Amino acid sequence: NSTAELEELLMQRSLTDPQLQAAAAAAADFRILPDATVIKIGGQSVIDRGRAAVYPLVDEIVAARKNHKLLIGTGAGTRARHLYSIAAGLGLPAGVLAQLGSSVADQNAAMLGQLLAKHGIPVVGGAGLSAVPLSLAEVNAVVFSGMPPYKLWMRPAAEGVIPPYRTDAGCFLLAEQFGCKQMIFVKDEDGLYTANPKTSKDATFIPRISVDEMKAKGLHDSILEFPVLDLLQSAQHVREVQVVNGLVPGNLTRALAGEHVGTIITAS
Template sequence: MTAPDTKDVPSALMRQTLLDQERLAAAEPGRERPPRRLLPWLDVVVLGGSTIVDRGGDVLLGVVEELRSTFTGPPPAEGGTRLLILTGAGVRARHVLGVGLDLGLPAGALAGLAATEAEQNGHLVAALLAADGVSYLPHGSVARQLPVHLAAAPAAVSTGYPPYGVHEFPTGGGRLPVHRTDAGALLLADAFGARSLTYVRDTESLAGFEGASLTTSGAAGHDGPLPVDRVVLDLLPRAKHVRSFAVVDGTERGRISEARAGRPTGFTLRAD
């Protein structure tokens, strides 16, 4: 029952939710106002925690040097690009997740623990690029201040883990968080309308997929592990801007630059 002094403001969303498909239909692609790319000059590069960072200086320093070699381009106003480097969690997160499972922690708590290690890897990569003006940005700064930082520096570093935290939900009857670095990077790249998205792995991660190009439906029917988490197969077809991405071997110099330039390399996944 409404109190006599209650005021209602007329609105299209009055007594509705943002899950109402009829209300959301007007914002779908193909309508009069398609979604706007916020940062169309942004390239997102994701460094695997266990496949790149945990490999130590022999691999990570080579990847950092290749990224640094791309910092000499013009600013976005003159047709150049800028780089957002995201890091994943590695072997330490797997250990923490194992302990958390033994203690009976829920998926939301496990997600927060694993995200902490991905953040530590981000600080490490940012430190290696500090001389170039690159700094680490937490999720809040990425969401509100990324354009300002990229106006002053050629790149920024953050964690690829999505900030779901305690709101992560278990799926498939398990407690492990399914939205990890691969999912978080895709969601972030799509939210900014990034120009490209590249996942950097090692040779073993691409075994059997080097040079392959699949659609999400084709990859879903593949038996065995994929170069990316399978939850991405559900997210990519729903993305508004990112319709494909590459997974490249970071141990081979030049692969990241080729992917950013749009040349076929590594493994390519496309939305149907």
């Protein structure tokens, strides 16, 4: 291998050539924001619940950013399910639904952002994104909308028009892109169970599990969007994620401190 053998392959072959693909795999690996943590705040599980859920999390973010650099992404929730229902009933394709859902995650980032403004924390992704480096350096946190940018170019699911990559996937990919040290999903249950705990009375709590074990137990599409599990197995930087209950006071803070609250899902 060499800077030169890669450059010759890159000039002489299709990007599909297994030979070129293999030389590229050997390249150096730079992490852009290695000391940051990405947190997803659920739309339906947290923000839709209003101040009883949101105010304690705002207080935690404000306290936690003294010691931890944070990128806080928002989910969408019930207004996006309403939009998907209307648009699906009209026969609109997954790519149009994807744009509609983004607007809802944007609303939620605006609302969270207004509660955090007096602490110096901006909402970003609007005007820019190199908003992010300066913000992280000075106030240690930023708020972003969690939907991926695919919009009309969204790959559809095998069945149905609901966009398969939504705000769990958007936040995960950003953590992965930037080479962040940790990805925490904030939801409204303690973590993963053997069955939906809202719907099933004798579900058992699962502290740690791999993607393969989740699939073997039928949990592919339970507490996280199922494509996130596959993205996790391909990831270069973020090879596990943590799911925690945002409705328990202090839970986010304890996860940032290294406590094993919730469920840890590992790529292998």
